[PDB]
Each structure stands twice: as structure tokens, then as C-alpha cells.
Amino acid sequence: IAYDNAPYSPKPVKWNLPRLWGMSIILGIVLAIGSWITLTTMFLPKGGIIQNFGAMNGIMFLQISLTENWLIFITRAAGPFWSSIPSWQLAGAVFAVDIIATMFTLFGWWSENWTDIVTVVRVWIWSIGIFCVLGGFYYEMSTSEAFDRLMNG
Amino acid sequence: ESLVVKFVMFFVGPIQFVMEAAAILAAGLSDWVDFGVICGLLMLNAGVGFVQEFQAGSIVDELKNTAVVIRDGQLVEIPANEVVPGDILQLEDGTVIPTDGRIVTEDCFLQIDQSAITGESLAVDKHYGDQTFSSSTVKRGEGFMVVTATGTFVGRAAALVNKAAGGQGHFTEVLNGIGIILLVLVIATLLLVWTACFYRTNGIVRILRYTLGITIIGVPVGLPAVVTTTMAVGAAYLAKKQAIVQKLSAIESLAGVEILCSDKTGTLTKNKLSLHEPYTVEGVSPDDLMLTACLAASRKKKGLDAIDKAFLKSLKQYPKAKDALTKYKVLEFHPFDPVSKKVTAVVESPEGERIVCVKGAPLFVLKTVEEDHPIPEDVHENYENKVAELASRGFRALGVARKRGEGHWEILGVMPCMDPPRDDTAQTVSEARHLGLRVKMLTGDAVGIAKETCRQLGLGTNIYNAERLGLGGGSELADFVENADGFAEVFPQHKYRVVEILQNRGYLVAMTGDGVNDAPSLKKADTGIAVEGATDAARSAADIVFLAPGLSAIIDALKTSRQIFHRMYSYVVYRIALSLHLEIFLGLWIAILDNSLDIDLIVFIAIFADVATLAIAYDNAPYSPKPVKWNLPRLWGMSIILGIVLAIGSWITLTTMFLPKGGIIQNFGAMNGIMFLQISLTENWLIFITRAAGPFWSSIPSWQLAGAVFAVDIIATMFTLFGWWSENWTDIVTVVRVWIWSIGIFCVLGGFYYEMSTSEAFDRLMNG
Ligand SMILES: [C][C][C][C][C][C][C][C][C][C][C][C][C][C][C]C(=O)O[C][C]([C]OP(=O)([O-])O[C][C][N+]([C])([C])[C][O-][P@@](=O)(O[C][C][N+]([C])([C])[C])O[C][C]([C]OC(=O)[C][C][C][C][C][C][C][C][C][C][C][C][C][C][C])OC(=O)[C][C][C][C][C][C][C]/[C]=[C]\[C][C][C][C][C][C][C][C])OC(=O)[C][C][C][C][C][C][C]/[C]=[C]\[C][C][C][C][C][C][C][C]
Ligand SMILES: CCCCCCCC/C=C\CCCCCCCC(=O)O[C@@H](COC(=O)CCCCCCCCCCCCCCC)COP(=O)([O-])OCC[N+](C)(C)C
Ligand SMILES: CCCCCCCC/C=C\CCCCCCCC(=O)O[C@@H](COC(=O)CCCCCCCCCCCCCCC)COP(=O)([O-])OCC[N+](C)(C)C
Ligand SMILES: CCCCCCCC/C=C\CCCCCCCC(=O)O[C@@H](COC(=O)CCCCCCCCCCCCCCC)COP(=O)([O-])OCC[N+](C)(C)C
Numbered sequence: 001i002a003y004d005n006a007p008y009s010p011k012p013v014k015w016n017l018p019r020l021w022g023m024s025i026i027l028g029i030v031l032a033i034g035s036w037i038t039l040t041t042m043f044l045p046k047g048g049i050i051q052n053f054g055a056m057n058g059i060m061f062l063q064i065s066l067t068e069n070w071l072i073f074i075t076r077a078a079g080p081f082w083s084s085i086p087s088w089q090l091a092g093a094v095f096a097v098d099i100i101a102t103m104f105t106l107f108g109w110w111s112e113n114w115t116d117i118v119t120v121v122r123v124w125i126w127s128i129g130i131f132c133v134l135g136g137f138y139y140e141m142s143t144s145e146a147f148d149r150l151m152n153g
Numbered sequence: 154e155s156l157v158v159k160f161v162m163f164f165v166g167p168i169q170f171v172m173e174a175a176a177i178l179a180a181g182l183s184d185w186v187d188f189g190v191i192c193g194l195l196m197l198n199a200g201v202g203f204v205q206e207f208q209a210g211s212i213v214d215e216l217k218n219t220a221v222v223i224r225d226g227q228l229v230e231i232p233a234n235e236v237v238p239g240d241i242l243q244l245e246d247g248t249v250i251p252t253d254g255r256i257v258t259e260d261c262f263l264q265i266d267q268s269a270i271t272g273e274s275l276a277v278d279k280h281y282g283d284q285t286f287s288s289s290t291v292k293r294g295e296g297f298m299v300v301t302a303t304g305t306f307v308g309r310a311a312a313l314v315n316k317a318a319g320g321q322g323h324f325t326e327v328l329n330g331i332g333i334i335l336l337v338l339v340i341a342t343l344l345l346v347w348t349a350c351f352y353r354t355n356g357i358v359r360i361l362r363y364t365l366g367i368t369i370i371g372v373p374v375g376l377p378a379v380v381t382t383t384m385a386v387g388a389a390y391l392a393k394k395q396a397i398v399q400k401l402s403a404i405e406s407l408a409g410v411e412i413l414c415s416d417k418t419g420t421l422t423k424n425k426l427s428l429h430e431p432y433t434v435e436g437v438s439p440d441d442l443m444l445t446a447c448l449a450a451s452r453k454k455k456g457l458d459a460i461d462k463a464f465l466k467s468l469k470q471y472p473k474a475k476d477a478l479t480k481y482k483v484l485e486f487h488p489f490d491p492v493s494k495k496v497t498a499v500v501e502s503p504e505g506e507r508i509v510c511v512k513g514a515p516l517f518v519l520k521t522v523e524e525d526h527p528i529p530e531d532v533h534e535n536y537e538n539k540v541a542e543l544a545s546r547g548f549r550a551l552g553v554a555r556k557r558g559e560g561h562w563e564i565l566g567v568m569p570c571m572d573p574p575r576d577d578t579a580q581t582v583s584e585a586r587h588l589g590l591r592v593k594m595l596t597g598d599a600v601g602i603a604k605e606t607c608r609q610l611g612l613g614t615n616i617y618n619a620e621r622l623g624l625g626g627g628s629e630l631a632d633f634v635e636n637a638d639g640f641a642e643v644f645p646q647h648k649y650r651v652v653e654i655l656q657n658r659g660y661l662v663a664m665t666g667d668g669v670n671d672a673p674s675l676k677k678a679d680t681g682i683a684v685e686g687a688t689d690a691a692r693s694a695a696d697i698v699f700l701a702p703g704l705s706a707i708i709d710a711l712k713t714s715r716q717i718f719h720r721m722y723s724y725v726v727y728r729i730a731l732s733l734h735l736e737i738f739l740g741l742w743i744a745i746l747d748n749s750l751d752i753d754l755i756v757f758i759a760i761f762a763d764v765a766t767l768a769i770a771y772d773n774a775p776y777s778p779k780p781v782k783w784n785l786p787r788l789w790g791m792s793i794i795l796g797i798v799l800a801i802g803s804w805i806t807l808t809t810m811f812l813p814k815g816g817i818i819q820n821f822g823a824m825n826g827i828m829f830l831q832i833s834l835t836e837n838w839l840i841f842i843t844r845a846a847g848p849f850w851s852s853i854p855s856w857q858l859a860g861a862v863f864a865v866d867i868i869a870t871m872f873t874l875f876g877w878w879s880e881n882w883t884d885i886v887t888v889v890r891v892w893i894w895s896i897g898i899f900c901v902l903g904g905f906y907y908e909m910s911t912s913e914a915f916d917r918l919m920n921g
């Protein structure tokens with residue numbers, strides 16, 4: 001993040017803590033709903049999100065790491081996440097970490113034995129869906145004049 | 154550049170980006186049929202866009218200098234490419250100037266015409282050391298000038314035009330805005346079906362197949378193609394009325410504009426000097442007094458001064474050109490002088506009557522002889538009070554007189570002249586005010602001369618100097634410029650800022666310009682308008698060029714501009730509902746039932762929604778008297794409901810087929826075929842409700858649109874009967890059941906859209 005490009009506000013900055021907390025209240029729950037949707041699929045017989053074979057701990061750690069890491073891309077951008085191109089240092093850092101996250105579940109390190117590649121790409125594409133949901137919420141929170149008023153009072 | 158501007162058209166706009174996402178996904182799924190259609194249709198959006206931009210670009214290119222110098226002390230003639238700035242050049246009478254120059258030394262002073270670039274229709278007398286501008290025409294004298302820089306209002310124009318053109322357009326903003334929201338709804342329904350496709354353990358190929366089908370309909374594949382086609386076909390009507398567009402987005406903006414800014418010089422006025430006759434002095438011959446003036450003028454191209462040329466064709470007598478020289482036998486003529494400021498002519502009359510006629514400034518004509526008129530101080534005040542009326546009227550003042558041979562002057566009077574506006578521009582403004590847009594005028598001329606054109610045109614005569622309150626470097630400024638009837642003495646960077654204030658307050662702005670002064674503003678303007686006398690920098694920077702003389706072609710252009718909007722407004726209301734239909738319908742079908750209409754049948758719905766609305770461009774439409782709105786919150790809310798009413802209707806039909814004994818199947822049918830028969834009929838006819846203001850029967854559909862839908866409905870009908878890409882067969886008796894039921898849904902849709910569109914409340918509720 002230190003090497004990420006950022007825009008400077010023309011006004012003095014705010015550190016608006018009540019809005020900061022309320023915006024992080026929601027995004028964590030949207031993550032929490034999303035991980036709970038994914039986890040309970042694995043409860044079903046025939047796998048749910050497991051297509052061939054997978055690890056219940058490995059898939060969620062694959063799920064959680066992908067969903068947590070990309071959350072930085074929404075927050076780093078004013079308004080919509082596509083407004084500002086991420087710096088190569090940040091983007092390279094997350095994408096490398098997502099790869100290291102991906103290797104852990106495939107080879108099943110510190111977890112149940114193995115998870116196949118077909119289950120892994122299912123988790124990746126689903127995590128992209130959660131990511132696009134997060135862009136909607138954060139944009140609808142951050143530029144909205146009402147949410148600042150409601151969380152302040 | 155051509156390949157670059159084409160390939161950005163494929164990229165730009167969120168609708169287009171996901172098509173490569175759709176194209177690669179269909180290619181990765183080895184469904185080359187779906188790969189061909191969108192990639193094929195993506196070229197069609199370029200195909201309409203590129204061919205028009207090339208062809209109309211050809212027309213404006215069909216519309217699109219040497220100097221005498223002293224080099225190493227010897228005089229040669231060189232073109233304008235190799236002049237190096239900060240060096241002395243010798244420019245003479247009648248030349249076109251390459252670059253700005255500082256006048257070194259002159260014994261008599263230059264007069265050049267600044268009408269071409271900065272617009273002053275009065276030749277300016279120019280002193281030593283004066284700032285001279287490029288591209289002007291010298292009307293008087295000889296001079297040495299040292300040049301300042303190479304191409305610089307031409308250089309100022311090019312830099313500002315390159316500075317401008319950001320903010321692609323008002324259309325592309327709302328075109329991207331709909332594209333974002335629909336993509337969100339794609340993601341919203343994709344998450345619903347991806348959740349369900351996990352709970353029932355599904356292969357990734359099956360899930361992506363459902364994902365492929367949703368994203369084809371959710372973001373409209375044909376909407377970039379149709380809407381550009383709709384405005385391009387309308388633009389062909391403009392070309393048939395002598396009006397050429399360069400970039401298409403201006404034509405919808407010409408509908409949405411409600412402030413027209415005007416330049417007095419080229420756009421409003423004929424830039425030829427002319428005289429008002431009712432505003433003349435008490436001289437005994439009102440008409441013969443100007444006939445005296447033509448006697449005191451040169452008759453051939455050496456002495457054809459700019460004002461003197463105005464007199465020659467000013468007469469109403471049929472031989473106006475020849476009447477100034479009918480056997481008058483000019484002996485000698487006095488040329489115009491910087492200091493005496495007179496032209497007088499000696500002519501010979503029958504019976505040896507040497508009579509002399511003069512022109513000049515009112516003060517210098519009045520003081521030829523002090524006592525020649527009776528009550529000499531009163532006739533002094535009489536004209537000078539009249540000149541005081543005339544100066545406050547903004548007319549340039551010229552006095553004439555007459556003397557006998559022995560030398561007694563007789564002062565005939567003073568006569569005014571100016572650059573008059575065209576005949577139609579009196580009315581072209583007048584029904585522009587009828588057509589709902591306030592008009593303002595932006596000129597570099599003096600305020601008082603612009604005040605005259607205000608009350609002649611009937612604008613309001615409330616204009617202000619650009620320099621004194623146009624900011625050099627505001628909400629209180631915003632109130633002033635919006636309330637200002639016009640701005641005079643404006644510079645190129647002020648004209649851009651006059652637009653800048655109005656865009657920030659929310660107005661859509663179109664302006665008409667010929668000179669290079671407002672060509673930077675033309676690129677900034679939502680609709681860049683050029684006239685028949687437009688300069689090259691204007692025509693390159695203007696979004697629309699008028700080939701016809703006069704400004705009257707805008708009312709023709711504006712009326713069809715609003716018609717194109719209502720043609721597009723009908724389609725975009727229609728097409729969002731279809732996406733919102735199949736997002737709900739396929740989204741729930743995959744969620745509740747884990748089945749969907751087969752992927753082969755999905756792409757055909759995208760084509761049929763497209764190709765039926767390709768004929769929207771040729772549909773007849775009414776133009777609103779007010780400026781158009783593009784009211785997006787109501788547009789979205791009205792399309793929210795109509796898609797759900799479709800979604801309820803398709804869900805009623807689908808669940809009938811769940812029953813044993815068929816439900817809607819009377820003899821035998823195909824579950825995929827009947828719904829595709831159902832969906833295509835319900836989607837296609839939705840255009841008929843939206844195309845009509847209020848009730849759908851209010852306006853008869855055009856044969857192009859009606860024939861397009863009815864043919865498509867037939868092609869929809871053949872597919873389910875013979876069961877192509879579906880289950881085997883569906884009999885005709887089931888098909889006519891679906892047709893009559895779809896008519897029922899259609900009549901329901903007429904009720905909702907009518908109860909939405911004309912209702913004052915729903916607009917308020919969806920806005921807030
Ligand atoms: C606002 C918020 C809202 C919330 C809502 C909540 C919901 C709740 C739901 C729950 C339900 C539960 C279910 C139960 C059932 C059971 O469990 O089971 C039992 C039965 C028997 O068992 P078994 O043993 O297992 O058996 C076996 C069989 N088998 C073999 C399996 C077979 O097969 P298949 O494959 O085939 C077919 C069949 N059929 C017959 C049908 C033909 O199949 C299978 C089945 C089983 O599976 C299952 O389980 C199913 C489950 C499903 C669940 C889902 C859930 C949904 C969720 C959604 C959510 C949304 C969110 C959004 C918000 C934001 O089989 C069978 O058979 C079964 C039957 C059926 C079942 C199911 C039914 C339906 C369900 C649900 C629906 C609802 C939806 C709602 C929507 C909302 C909107 C918003 O036994 C029996 O019999 C059963 C009976 C019972 C029934 C129940 C009823 C329901 C209740 C309620 C409803 C709802 C209401 C609420 C409303 C709201 C308002 C607002
Ligand atoms: C934003 C917050 C939104 C609210 C969240 C609440 C969501 C609700 C959460 C969970 C609800 C579903 C749990 C029920 C599981 C049933 C178990 C079962 O037996 O499976 C049954 C199917 O039943 C289904 O799979 C239906 C699932 C559709 C859910 C649609 C709502 C998703 C919302 C999207 C938002 C998600 C993203 C949210 C943000 C990331 C049967 O399975 P089977 O018998 O084994 O197979 C049949 C045999 N066969 C294969 C031949 C057919
Ligand atoms: C938003 C809601 C979305 C989630 C809806 C969940 C619906 C889906 C629920 C169930 C799907 C069907 C599961 C049972 C079907 C098969 C029966 C069976 O095998 O027994 C199961 C009993 O285990 C359970 O009963 C699971 C209980 C799920 C609780 C979900 C908590 C939701 C909280 C969310 C709040 C978040 C919001 C936070 C906001 C503060 C097996 O249990 P097991 O020991 O683990 O496995 C044994 C191995 N085997 C199964 C392979 C044999
Ligand atoms: C917006 C919120 C949306 C909520 C949607 C609710 C989704 C609920 C929808 C479906 C839930 C139940 C699905 C039924 C599927 C079971 C089928 C069956 O065979 O019975 C099973 C029993 O099942 C159990 O043992 C218990 C599992 C049900 C508890 C689920 C609680 C969900 C909590 C909701 C939290 C919401 C809190 C959220 C608040 C924020 C079979 O077990 P068995 O007979 O003992 O033997 C199995 C043998 N076998 C393994 C070979 C098969």
C-alpha cells in the first residue's frame with residue numbers, strides 16, 4: 001500500500017471515524033454472508049462447490065484469502081474500484097499472494113489431503129462475484145451524502 | 154489514426170467490454186456459434202460508426218500562403234512554411250498574413266479586416282507597434298512587421314482544441330451509465346444462479362453455460378449497434394437537408410440543448426456592410442443622399458474600399474452599380490486620407506455645371522464651411538444630437554455634403570451603416586425561443602454595436618463586457634452568466650469559459666461559430682455548429698457543419714434531432730426491460746429449477762430483440778416542443794416494472810407446462826420451444842408500447858418497424874413449430890394458444906406503460 005498511487009483531496013482530510021466504522025461494518029458482513037454461502041455448499045452430499053474432490057478447510061482458506069485480499073482494490077479507489085488503476089506494487093503483491101493462497105489448497109498443506117484444480121477455479125470465479133458485489137456496496141456507501149449523516153447522527 | 158479511433162470504439166463503453174468476456178467465454182466453451190454472433194455484431198457497431206465517420210469526414214475535408222520578405226538584404230518571395238519568428242517582414246496591401254507581427258515603422262497607418270478570425274466587421278486603423286493577428290486581409294496601406302511566433306490565435310485554437318474534447322459526450326455518459334447499471338444487474342443475477350449451481354453440485358461447464366446465457370441478454374449486445382444506427386440514419390436525413398455531423402453524439406445533444414450561443418459576425422450577420430435607410434437625417438432627398446455618396450466613391454478595384462463597396466450595391470434603383478456613373482464624367486477624385494478623412498469627387502453635369510460630392514466623417518464634413526448652412530450652431534447640434542442618438546444606436550456614422558463649382562458647400566447630411574443580420578436569423582431566433590431554448594450571443598465586437606443586433610433580433614439588449622466581469626482566472630458568477638442575455642468583446646478563452654459555467658450548472662450548450670476564436674469553444678460545446686462561412690479550424694472542431702447559407706437549417710436540424718431522441722428513448726426503455734425480463738426469468742429458472750432455455754435459443758432472442766429494433770431508425774416519431782429530458786430515474790423505474798410484468802407473464806406460462814396433460818400444450822409441444830415462442834412474441838411487441846407517447850394506439854407504427862417485428866415473430870414461430878435447436882416438435886394448435894396469450898400480456902403492458910408514462914406522480918416518486 002505504501003507504494004500505491006493515491007489522489008490528494010483539495011480539502012483538509014477528515015478521518016471520519018463513525019462513517020469508517022459503519023462502512024466496515026457492512027463490508028465485513030457482506031464478506032460474512034458470502035463465506036457462509038460457500039461453506040454450507042460443502043455440507044451437501046456430492047460436494048456442493050466440490051466438483052471432483054476437495055478439502056473443507058482448504059477451500060474456505062482459498063475462499064477467504066481471495067475474498068479478503070481483493071477487498072483492498074475497492075477501498076483504494078475513490079468511488080468505483082475501476083476509477084484508478086492499481087499500482088504494480090500493490091497489484092503484484094495481491095496477485096502473488098492469491099497464487100500462494102491457491103497453491104496451499106491444491107496441494108493441501110496443513111489441511112485435508114488434496115483439492116483438485118476444477119474446484120479451485122470454481123472458488124476463484126465465485127470470489128470474483130463477491131468482489132463485484134463489494135464494489136457496489138462500497139461505492140453506494142462512500143459517495144453517498146446520506147450514509148455519512150446516518151452514521152454520524 | 155483511423156485504426157486507432159476504430160479500436161477504441163470496440164473498447165469504450167461498459168456494454169462493449171463484457172462482450173469480449175462473453176466472446177472468450179463462449180470460445181472457451183467451444184460454442185463457436187455464440188462466438189460468431191457477438192463478435193460479428195461488435196463489428197456492426199463499428200460498421201455503422203466507422204463508415205459514417207469516414208464518409209462525413211470526407212465531406213468536411215472537401216471543405217478544407219506566400220510572403221514577400223527581405224533575406225540577407227535582398228527582396229524575395231517565400232511561402233509561409235519557412236518564416237522564422239522574431240524577424241522583420243514586409244507585407245503590403247491586400248495580402249493574407251501568415252503569422253502575428255509587430256509593426257516596425259509606418260508613415261501612413263494600416264487598415265486590415267479582422268472579420269475572419271476575431272470577427273470585427275469594421276476595418277481597424279492600426280498604428281506602429283500594434284499587435285497584428287494572422288490570416289487577416291489588409292485593406293489599406295504598406296508596412297513592415299516583425300513576426301512574433303509561428304502557427305498565434307491559430308496556435309491558440311489548436312492548443313485549446315487539443316486541450317478540449319474530454320468528456321466524450323452527454324450521450325456516452327448516460328450510455329455508459331446505463332451500461333454500468335445493467336452490468337450490476339448481470340452480476341446481481343449471476344450471483345443468484347452461481348449460488349444455486351453450487352448447492353446442486355454442478356460441473357463448471359454447466360454453470361458457465363448458464364452464465365453465458367444470462368450475460369448475452371443482461372447486457373444488450375445490439376444496443377451499441379442500434380442506437381448508433383438510429384442516430385446515423387437520422388443523420389443521413391441531415392445530410393439530405395445540407396447539414397453534416399462529424400461525431401454522432403451531438404445530434405442527441407442538439408435535442409437536449411436549451412441554451413444556444415451565437416456569434417454576431419459570421420453566423421448571425423452577412424459580414425457585408427450595409428446601410429439602414431429609415432435612420433437617416435432630415436435631408437431633402439432621403440434616397441438621393443446615398444446616391445450622392447456613391448458619386449464620391451471609386452468605381453474599380455484599386456479604390457474599392459470596404460465601406461465604399463457597401464454603397465455600390467446599396468441602391469434600390471435597378472442599375473445601382475451603374476447609376477453612380479451614368480454619364481457623370483468624373484474629372485478628378487480625392488482618395489481617402491488618414492488625417493483629412495474625406496473622399497470627394499469632381500463630376501460634370503449638363504450646361505457646364507461642375508458639381509462636387511463628398512463623403513467623410515460627420516465632424517470633418519460638418520466643418521468644411523462653418524457658415525454654409527443657416528442656424529450653423531443649431532445644425533451642428535442637430536446632427537451631433539442625432540449622432541449622439543446614432544452612437545447610442547451603435548451605427549458607424551458617415552457624413553456627406555455637396556458643393557457648387559465656385560466653392561460653397563451644402564451639407565446634405567449623415568448616413569449610418571453596419572453589418573446587418575440575415576433575414577432568416579430574425580425568425581431562426583424567434584422559433585428557437587418557441588422550440589424551448591433561450592438564446593444568447595457571444596461576440597468579440599463592441600457592446601454597443603452588439604446592443605443594436607440585440608433589439609433588431611429581439612433578444613433583450615442586456616449584454617456585458619467580457620473583460621470586466623468574465624473571470625481572468627463561481628456560484629455568483631453562475632447566476633450572472635445564466636441571467637446574462639449575451640456577452641460582447643469576448644476573447645477565445647472567455648467563450649470557452651462561458652460554456653464552462655453553463656456545463657457546471659447543468660445546461661447542455663450548443664453554439665454557432667465561423668471564426669477560429671470560438672473553434673476552441675466548438676470542441677468543448679455539446680453540439681458544435683458551423684455555418685457556411687466557417688473557417689477551417691471551426692469546421693475541424695465543429696461537431697456539425699452547415700452547408701447551406703444562413704442559420705435557418707438549425708430548426709430543421711433541431712426538430713429531427715429531438716425525433717432521434719424519442720426514437721432512442723423508446724428503444725432504451727424497451728431494451729432494458731428485455732434484459733430485466735430474462736435476468737429475472739432465467740435467474741429464477743436456474744435457481745428454483747436448475748433448468749434454463751437452451752443456450753442456442755438464448756442467442757436468437759438477442760438477435761431478434763436487436764434486428765427488429767434496427768428498423769427503429771426508420772420509425773416515425775414526434776418531436777417534443779420543449780427540450781428533451783433523458784430522465785434516467787423514471788426511465789429505469791418504468792423499465793423495472795415492465796420487465797417484471799414480463800417476468801410474471803413468462804412464469805405463468807412456464808408453470809402451465811409443468812402440469813400433467815400439458816397445461817398450455819394442447820396436443821404436443823416443446824418446453825424450450827414454447828417459451829422461446831412465448832418470450833420472442835412478448836419481447837418483440839414491447840417496442841410498440843414504448844414507441845408511442847401514452848397509449849400504444851396513439852401513433853401508427855411505421856411499415857419498416859411493423860414489418861420488422863412481424864417478420865421476426867414469424868421466424869420466431871417457425872422455430873418452435875419445426876423444433877429447431879429444441880425438443881422435436883410443437884403443433885400449430887399450441888402455437889396459436891401462445892400467440893393469443895401473448896396478445897393478452899401485450900394489452901396488459903399498454904396499461905402499465907400508459908399509467909406510468911403520462912403520470913405526474915411516478916416521475917416524482919422515482920426522482921424523489
Ligand atoms: C426475507 C428473508 C426470507 C427468508 C426465507 C426463508 C426460506 C426458508 C425455506 C426453508 C425450507 C426448508 C425445506 C425443508 C424441506 C426438507 O427439509 O425435506 C423434507 C421433505 C422430505 O425430506 P427428504 O427425506 O430429504 O426427501 C428426499 C427426496 N429426494 C430424494 C431428495 C428427492 O428429490 P428431488 O431431487 O426432485 C424434485 C422433488 N420434487 C418433489 C419437488 C419434484 O428434490 C429434492 C427435495 C429435497 O431437497 C431439499 O431439501 C429442498 C430444500 C430447498 C431449500 C431452499 C431454500 C431457499 C432459500 C431462498 C432464500 C432467499 C434469500 C433472499 C433474501 C434476501 O425433495 C423434496 O421433496 C423437498 C420438497 C420441497 C422442499 C423445498 C420447498 C421450497 C423451499 C423453500 C422455498 C422458499 C423460498 C422463499 C423465497 C423468499 C424470497 C425473499 O419433507 C417435506 O414434505 C418438505 C415439506 C416442507 C415444505 C417447506 C415449505 C417452505 C416454508 C416456507 C417457504 C418460505 C416462506 C418465507 C417467505 C419470505 C417472506 C419475505
Ligand atoms: C446479500 C445477501 C443475500 C441474502 C443471502 C441469503 C442466500 C440464501 C442462502 C442459502 C439458501 C439455499 C440453502 C438451501 C440448501 C438446500 C440443500 C439441498 O438439499 O439442495 C437442494 C437444492 O436447493 C437449492 O440449491 C436452492 C438454492 C437456491 C438459493 C437461491 C438464493 C441465493 C441468493 C444469492 C445471494 C448469494 C450471494 C450473497 C453475497 C455473496 C437439492 O440438492 P440435491 O438434492 O443434492 O441435487 C438435486 C439432484 N439434481 C442435481 C439432479 C437436481
Ligand atoms: C444467510 C444464510 C446463508 C446460509 C444458509 C444455510 C442453509 C444451508 C443449511 C443446510 C444445508 C443442508 C445441510 C444438511 C443436509 C444434509 C444432512 C446432513 O448431512 O447433516 C448435516 C448437519 O449439518 C447441518 O445441519 C448444517 C447446518 C447449517 C447451519 C448454517 C448456519 C447459517 C448461519 C448463517 C448466518 C450468516 C450471517 C451472519 C450475520 C450476523 C451434516 O453436518 P456435518 O457434520 O458438517 O457433515 C457431515 C458429512 N456429510 C454431510 C458429508 C455426510
Ligand atoms: C435470508 C436468510 C435465508 C435463510 C435460508 C434458510 C435455508 C434453509 C433451507 C434448507 C435447510 C434444510 C434443508 C433440508 C435438506 C435436508 C434433506 C434431508 O434429507 O434431511 C436431512 C436432515 O437435515 C438435518 O440434519 C438438519 C439440517 C437442516 C438445518 C438447516 C438450518 C438452516 C439455518 C438457516 C440459518 C438462517 C439464519 C440467517 C439469518 C441472517 C438428512 O439428515 P439424516 O436424515 O439424519 O441422514 C442423512 C443421510 N444422508 C447423508 C445419506 C442424506
Ligand SMILES: CCCCCCCC/C=C\CCCCCCCC(=O)O[C@@H](COC(=O)CCCCCCCCCCCCCCC)COP(=O)([O-])OCC[N+](C)(C)C
Nearest residue numbers: 338341342343345353736737738740741744745746747748
Ligand atoms: C418479491 C421478491 C420475491 C422473489 C421471488 C420469489 C420466488 C420464489 C418463491 C418460491 C419458489 C420455491 C418453489 C417451490 C418448489 C418446490 C418444488 C421444488 O422443485 O423444489 C426445488 C428447490 O426449491 C428451491 O430451492 C427454491 C429456491 C428459490 C429461491 C429464490 C429466491 C431469490 C429471490 C431473488 C429474486 C430473483 C430476481 C433475480 C435477480 C434479478 C427442488 O430442488 P432441485 O432438485 O434443484 O429441483 C429439481 C431439479 N431437477 C429438475 C433437475 C431434478
Ligand SMILES: CCCCCCCC/C=C\CCCCCCCC(=O)O[C@@H](COC(=O)CCCCCCCCCCCCCCC)COP(=O)([O-])OCC[N+](C)(C)C
Nearest residue numbers: 737741745746797800801804805808809810811812813814
Ligand atoms: C407470481 C407467481 C406466478 C407463478 C405461480 C406458480 C404456481 C404454479 C406452481 C406449480 C404448479 C403445479 C406443479 C406441480 C403439479 C404436478 C406435480 C409435478 O408434476 O411435479 C412438478 C414439480 O415441479 C414443481 O414443483 C414446480 C414448482 C413451481 C415453482 C414456480 C416458481 C414461482 C416463482 C415466480 C416468481 C416470478 C416473479 C418475479 C418477481 C421477482 C414437475 O416438475 P418438472 O420436472 O419441471 O416436470 C416433470 C414432467 N411432468 C410434470 C410433465 C411429469
Ligand SMILES: CCCCCCCC/C=C\CCCCCCCC(=O)O[C@@H](COC(=O)CCCCCCCCCCCCCCC)COP(=O)([O-])OCC[N+](C)(C)C
Nearest residue numbers: 737741745797800801802804805808809811812813814815
Ligand atoms: C401473488 C403470488 C401468487 C402465488 C400463487 C401460488 C400458487 C400455488 C398454488 C398451487 C401450487 C401447488 C399446486 C398443487 C398441485 C399438486 C397436484 C398434486 O397431485 O401434487 C403433486 C406434488 O406437487 C409437488 O411436487 C410440488 C408442487 C407444489 C409447489 C408449488 C410452489 C409454488 C410457489 C409459489 C411461488 C409464489 C411466489 C411469488 C412471489 C412474488 C403431485 O406430485 P407427486 O405426488 O409426487 O406425483 C405426481 C404423479 N402425476 C404426475 C401423475 C400427477
Ligand code: BEF
Nearest residue numbers: 416418419667668
Ligand atoms: F467570425 Be466569428 F467567429 F463569427
